[PDB]
Design a protein around this ligand. Structure first.
Ligand SMILES: *[C@@H]1O[C@H](CO)[C@@H](O[C@@H]2O[C@H](CO)[C@@H](O)[C@H](O)[C@H]2NC(C)=O)[C@H](O)[C@H]1NC(C)=O
Ligand SMILES: CCCCCCCCCCCCCCCCCC(=O)O
Ligand SMILES: *[C@@H]1O[C@H](CO)[C@@H](O)[C@H](O)[C@H]1NC(C)=O
Ligand SMILES: *[C@@H]1O[C@H](CO)[C@@H](O)[C@H](O)[C@H]1NC(C)=O
Ligand SMILES: *[C@@H]1O[C@H](CO)[C@@H](O)[C@H](O)[C@H]1NC(C)=O
Ligand SMILES: *[C@@H]1O[C@H](CO)[C@@H](O)[C@H](O)[C@H]1NC(C)=O
Ligand SMILES: *[C@@H]1O[C@H](CO)[C@@H](O)[C@H](O)[C@H]1NC(C)=O
Ligand SMILES: *[C@@H]1O[C@H](CO)[C@@H](O)[C@H](O)[C@H]1NC(C)=O
Ligand SMILES: *[C@@H]1O[C@H](CO)[C@@H](O)[C@H](O)[C@H]1NC(C)=O
Ligand SMILES: *[C@@H]1O[C@H](CO)[C@@H](O)[C@H](O)[C@H]1NC(C)=O
Ligand SMILES: *[C@@H]1O[C@H](CO)[C@@H](O)[C@H](O)[C@H]1NC(C)=O
Ligand SMILES: *[C@@H]1O[C@H](CO)[C@@H](O)[C@H](O)[C@H]1NC(C)=O
Ligand SMILES: *[C@@H]1O[C@H](CO)[C@@H](O)[C@H](O)[C@H]1NC(C)=O
Ligand SMILES: *[C@@H]1O[C@H](CO)[C@@H](O)[C@H](O)[C@H]1NC(C)=O
Lengths: 264, 372, 49, 99, 49, 50, 49, 49, 50, 38
């Protein structure tokens, strides 16, 4: 079950700035032509976010912290990213959350998983489902429409929070044509679900699919290739935001009060 | 005006009274058309409840909440509702209802509340301080007790740290209570965190089992998939009414709106915190709520030691256009300040005796009468 | 448009009466200011053709 | 901006009224600022405290607005008395007073 | 020195005293100009050149 | 308790601000008088008595 | 220096903004008073030697 | 006001409560001035069978 | 006693029965370290207009 | 400055009428690649 993809291609982590991104509707209320000041876990403006690549032989799916929240943005064109994994130790000793996506559906579980180091999915093109070697004490299950739907054209932005015992996800899909990094601009994330997983989360990891079509050797850390793909991770902090609203009810603008004295 | 001045005599002048009120005539209710009844039996009348350390959470949706069905079946020793009054549960609709069920001993029922401490609260089941919901409990000695002991119910006794609200820890790992590490094996100063409740019919009320159900929900601010037994009525527009949209009472006029609400949005607010819009659950159409009271009212009177007849100035009324007036009169004069009733226009011009408004002054003259 | 809040406010007391007294005094003062500034002459003089 | 004083007067009045309107979104230590959520969720006796909090806060807001209006009215009265003196001494006569 | 000095206490609690837009020396310069004008020229400098 | 203290300290600040406004009005009256005195006594000769 | 009290004050409302508006108006008024009193002459006249 | 109920229902004897007793048998006003007293009577109001 | 501030050595002398110290306001401007029995001065960290 | 340290503005030895009343005797303005001056 465990194919260690220990291809050794060391590249330094690349950092980028998030101009104005990660803004989400704090509440399920309608407001129009009004400026509203709210305090919630937001991604600070012009924040130093990490950059990860999956281009060839570079694969980036390390374990990352979940301090208070995550702004996950993926510029993709092949649905290589299929979901994420959340947990503390990512082993059978503790419960963990798994979000994965089959074509036209989603699988969510909060069940003791002995996650497989270098977890992944595969493309030939269903292929492989090597993510966990075990599932025990399985408590929560849920299925819904795909969270991820269809060079680097679509920008899937996700915000994850683990308030008290509810896992909240805010998502948005924005088509673009930029191929280098985040498109400077604006877009608000609407709420998607509020999962009552009721677990403890401190670390998370991303699940990327691999392509093995032209030739298939012993499927070790070899005979695999990842299409061009990258994702950006930003950590939210308690911040006070001034949100603008238009006639329709969309935000369209915001201000980070603590960014600098001018914004304050 | 006399009540406002706390006197029975009003000296000559003009006074400002309360704005024009219109009292509502109808009282409508609009709940989603739901006929199914909530799974009261499966939550309260189900055998084989879960242990506190692995408390089960059940989602509840698309059901009417008529708790009167429980009166004949079961009686609850404890029933506390936080963030809502029990009397209003029949007139409310709930957004995200979750039923958390488990079994504990009577001594530990008090621990099921925000701000408490103990093994249950700290290690097994913790409630948030800002908790909206209700807590229910009832003895189950006749059910969860057996001769010789029932050890199927367990509770976490040792943990490295206190739990966070609505957090479940099913981990079964040997607790290290000392500096010496023990790896997956029980030993001196090392304990198995889980322990079994000793439930017997003979033991006291304190150690007797208690089946606890915790209902967590949000009131308003979002679509309400669960509703009470109150009956909906027909829709009324362009008329002051006492509405109830998914438990949100109020008073105002309802009209069609051009606003577009996203699927997750039910209510709408203005610069203030006030529901200026709402979505009808049955018709899925947007409505605009507008207060019915609107317009200043001013009273023009002489000293009342000279005459008891008065004139009323209705600001924000254009009689030149069922006017928003308390009582219509034969003499109506329109002014830039507003419609003046009870005073007759005279084409002459005198010094101002009573400063009505823009360029209009009243007086008492001539069978005397009020003039403008 | 709430009966309960109004019936509570009746108990809380009558400070709004004095608020309105102050505002009415302000308004009358504004009218007096306008009269004092401009209405310095009662005879209305017309410019000759 | 020849007439800055008059426009500032108008803006001050409008801003005061708008602030008074927007101070109705303040919870004043209560559970809400809508007065309908309180009545719907809570029974009368438990809602009395919240409604009293909101009444106290809004009364304080109104009193503050009234006090500010009184002070501004005093300033405007001073200006109007000066204007009347100027009309009388400069328009209706020739003033030897300097400036 | 905060509990001792009053300004430090006022300033650890959010209260600050802003500096005036005109220094004492500049006000003295204005006054000296006025004295020189009223001495050399009289009341003419207040009406023009 | 924190709401009680917030309300009390806000009231204290509002009282201080109101007193400052009134004192500023008084000082403005004094300053206007001083400007009138400069203009009429320094920049000219005043026939006004006292 | 308390996060909890600050996050409560955000709810209690924005009256401090208008407090600061009043204080800023007072300060600007003081500067205007000083200018009106002393800055009556823009030409700076020097006393003759 | 005297009557007999079961222990589980004693909590219902208070303003603002709900249940069969409060809703259908005996209801107290919200603005209630008085005292509520209760004591077990199994030895008196109970019989074999 | 929680709080937030800077801690520095102090010349204050505390009697045996005294642990904390206060200022003109009700605010802990001084404290005694239980382990070292030395006086400390608590000073707010936020200071200066912007 | 006697009011305090000013950052983001360059001192100019010239003297103009006050556009922005910083403090004691210092006034800022926007001038000249434009930049802020004190
Ligand atoms: C959630 O899990 C984290 C660990 O993933 C817990 O934090 C650890 O706590 C232990 C002691 O209990 C320490 O030895 C570790 O150093 C901590 N790790 C980190 C990263 O802080 C945390 O306590 C757990 N939360 C709850 C509520 O139990
Ligand atoms: C079973 C799931 C129902 C959930 C409905 C939403 C919650 C609405 C409140 C219902 C509370 C019922 C508690 C029991 C009522 C009192 C009964 C009694 O005192 O005998
Ligand atoms: C290699 O794979 C095996 C699968 O049996 C696993 O036990 C081991 O930890 C892996 N090692 C690394 C470095 O990934
Ligand atoms: C992000 O952090 C790295 C290392 O701390 C730093 O070199 C980089 O300059 C930062 N980002 C920007 C935009 O400066
Ligand atoms: C494929 O999707 C179906 C439902 O759409 C789901 O039941 C199934 O588990 C998915 N397959 C995989 C391998 O995830
Ligand atoms: C989890 O599963 C294991 C393996 O069957 C079992 O031994 C353990 O009791 C389970 N834990 C539960 C049900 O809490
Ligand atoms: C607001 O909605 C209308 C449709 O009702 C649309 O025509 C208009 O473009 C929207 N406003 C903006 C700024 O997009
Ligand atoms: C459900 O209630 C009925 C009577 O109301 C009772 O006879 C039955 O035993 C209950 N169900 C269970 C599982 O106890
Ligand atoms: C029931 O409500 C739905 C909307 O939820 C509506 O489409 C339908 O017409 C309603 N049916 C009746 C009989 O009112
Ligand atoms: C006012 O009332 C008194 C007492 O009734 C009466 O004597 C007097 O004539 C009245 N004045 C007028 C103007 O009617
Ligand atoms: C009142 O309405 C009429 C039309 O009905 C219009 O001609 C007139 O100007 C209006 N007057 C005012 C004061 O609004
Ligand atoms: C008064 O003026 C109205 C028109 O404003 C006219 O209809 C009426 O006949 C006039 N009456 C007298 C007595 O002049
Ligand atoms: C323990 O505290 C005392 C003061 O109460 C101190 O004198 C001693 O040095 C401390 N010992 C250690 C090991 O910290
Ligand atoms: C401006 O004055 C400073 C000293 O205050 C001096 O160092 C600098 O050379 C001067 N520059 C010009 C252009 O006069």
């Amino acid at each position: 079950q465990c194919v260690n993809l220990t291809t050794r291609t060391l590249l330094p982590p690349a950092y980028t700035n998030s101009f104005t991104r990660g803004v989400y509707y704090p509440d399920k209320v309608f407001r129009s032509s009004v400026l509203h000041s709210t305090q919630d876990l937001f991604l600070p403006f012009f924040s130093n976010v990490t950059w990860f690549h999956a281009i060839h032989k570079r694969f980036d799916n390390p374990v990352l912290p979940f301090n208070d929240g995550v702004y996950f943005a993926s510029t993709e064109k092949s649905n290589i990213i299929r979901g994420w994994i959340f947990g503390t130790t990512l082993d059978s000793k503790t419960q963990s959350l798994l979000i994965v996506n089959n074509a036209t559906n989603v699988v969510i579980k909060v069940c003791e998983f002995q996650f497989c180091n270098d977890p992944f999915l595969g493309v030939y093109m269903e292929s492989e489902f090597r993510v966990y070697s075990s599932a025990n004490n399985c408590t929560f299950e849920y299925v819904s429409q795909p969270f991820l739907m269809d060079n680097f054209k679509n920008l899937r932005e996700f915000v994850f929070k683990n308030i008290d015992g509810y896992f909240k996800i805010y998502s948005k899909h924005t088509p673009i044509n930029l191929v280098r990094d985040l498109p400077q601009g604006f877009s608000a994330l609407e709420p998607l679900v509020d999962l009552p997983i009721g677990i403890n989360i401190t670390r998370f990891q991303t699940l990327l699919a691999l392509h093995r079509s032209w030739l298939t050797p012993g499927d070790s850390s070899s005979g695999w290739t990842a299409g061009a793909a990258a994702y950006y991770v930003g950590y939210l902090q308690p911040r006070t935001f001034l949100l603008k609203y238009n006639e329709n009810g969309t935000i369209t603008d915001a201000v980070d009060c603590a960014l600098d004295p001018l914004s304050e | 005006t006399k009540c406002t001045l706390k006197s029975f005599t009003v000296e000559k002048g003009i006074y400002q009274t309360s704005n024009f009120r219109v009292q509502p005539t109808e009282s409508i209710v609009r709940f989603p058309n739901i006929t199914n009844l909530c799974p009261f039996g499966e939550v309260f009348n189900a055998t084989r409840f879960a242990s506190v350390y692995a408390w089960n959470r059940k989602r509840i949706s698309n059901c009417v909440a008529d708790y009167s069905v429980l009166y004949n079946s079961a009686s609850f020793s404890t029933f506390k509702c936080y963030g809502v009054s029990p009397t209003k549960l029949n007139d409310l609709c709930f957004t995200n209802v979750y039923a958390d069920s488990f079994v504990i001993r009577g001594d530990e029922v008090r621990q099921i509340a925000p701000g408490q401490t103990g093994k249950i609260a700290d290690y097994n089941y913790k409630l948030p301080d800002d908790f909206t919901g209700c807590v229910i409990a009832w003895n189950s000695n006749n059910l969860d007790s057996k001769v010789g002991g029932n050890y199927n119910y367990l509770y976490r006794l040792f943990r490295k740290s206190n739990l966070k609200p609505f957090e479940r820890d099913i981990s079964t790992e040997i607790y290290q209570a000392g500096s010496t590490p023990c790896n997956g094996v029980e030993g001196f100063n090392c304990y198995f965190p889980l322990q079994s409740y000793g439930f017997q019919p003979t033991n006291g009320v304190g150690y007797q089992p208690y089946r606890v159900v915790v209902l967590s929900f949000e009131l308003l601010h979002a679509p309400a998939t669960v509703c009470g037994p109150k009956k909906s009525t027909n829709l009324v527009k362009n008329k002051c009414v006492n509405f109830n949209f998914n438990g949100l009472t109020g008073t105002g006029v309802l009209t069609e709106s051009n606003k577009k609400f996203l699927p997750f949005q039910q209510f709408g607010r203005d610069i203030a915190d006030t529901t200026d819009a709402v979505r009808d659950p049955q018709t899925l159409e947007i409505l605009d709520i507008t207060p019915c009271s609107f317009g200043g009212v001013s009273v023009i009177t002489p000293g009342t030691n000279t005459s008891n007849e008065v004139a009323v100035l209705y600001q924000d009324v254009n009689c030149t256009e069922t006017w928003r007036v308390y009582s219509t009169g034969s003499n109506v004069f329109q002014t830039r300040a507003g419609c003046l009733i009870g005073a007759e226009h005279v084409n002459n011009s005198y010094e101002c005796d009573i400063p009505i408004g823009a360029g209009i002054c009243a007086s008492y003259q001539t069978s005397q009468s009020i003039i403008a | 448009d709430s009966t309960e809040c109004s019936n509570l406010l009746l108990q809380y007391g009558s400070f709004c009466t004095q608020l309105n007294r102050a505002l009415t005094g302000i308004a009358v003062e504004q009218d007096k200011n306008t009269q004092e500034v401009f209405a310095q002459v009662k005879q209305i003089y017309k410019t000759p053709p | 901006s020849a007439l800055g004083k008059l426009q500032d007067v108008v803006n001050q009045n409008a801003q005061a009224l708008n602030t008074l309107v927007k101070q109705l979104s303040s919870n004043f230590g209560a559970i809400s600022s809508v007065l309908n959520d309180i009545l719907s969720r809570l029974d009368p006796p438990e809602a009395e405290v919240q409604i009293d909090r909101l009444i106290t806060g809004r009364l304080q807001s109104l009193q503050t607005y009234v006090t500010q209006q009184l002070i501004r009215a005093a300033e405007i009265r001073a200006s109007a008395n000066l204007a009347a003196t100027k009309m009388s001494e400069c328009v209706l006569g020739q003033s030897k007073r300097v400036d | 020195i905060a509990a001792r000095d009053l300004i430090c206490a006022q300033k650890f609690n959010g209260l600050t005293v802003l500096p005036p837009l005109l220094t004492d020396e500049m006000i003295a310069q204005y006054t000296s100009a006025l004295l020189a004008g009223t001495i050399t020229s009289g009341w003419t400098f207040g009406a023009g050149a």
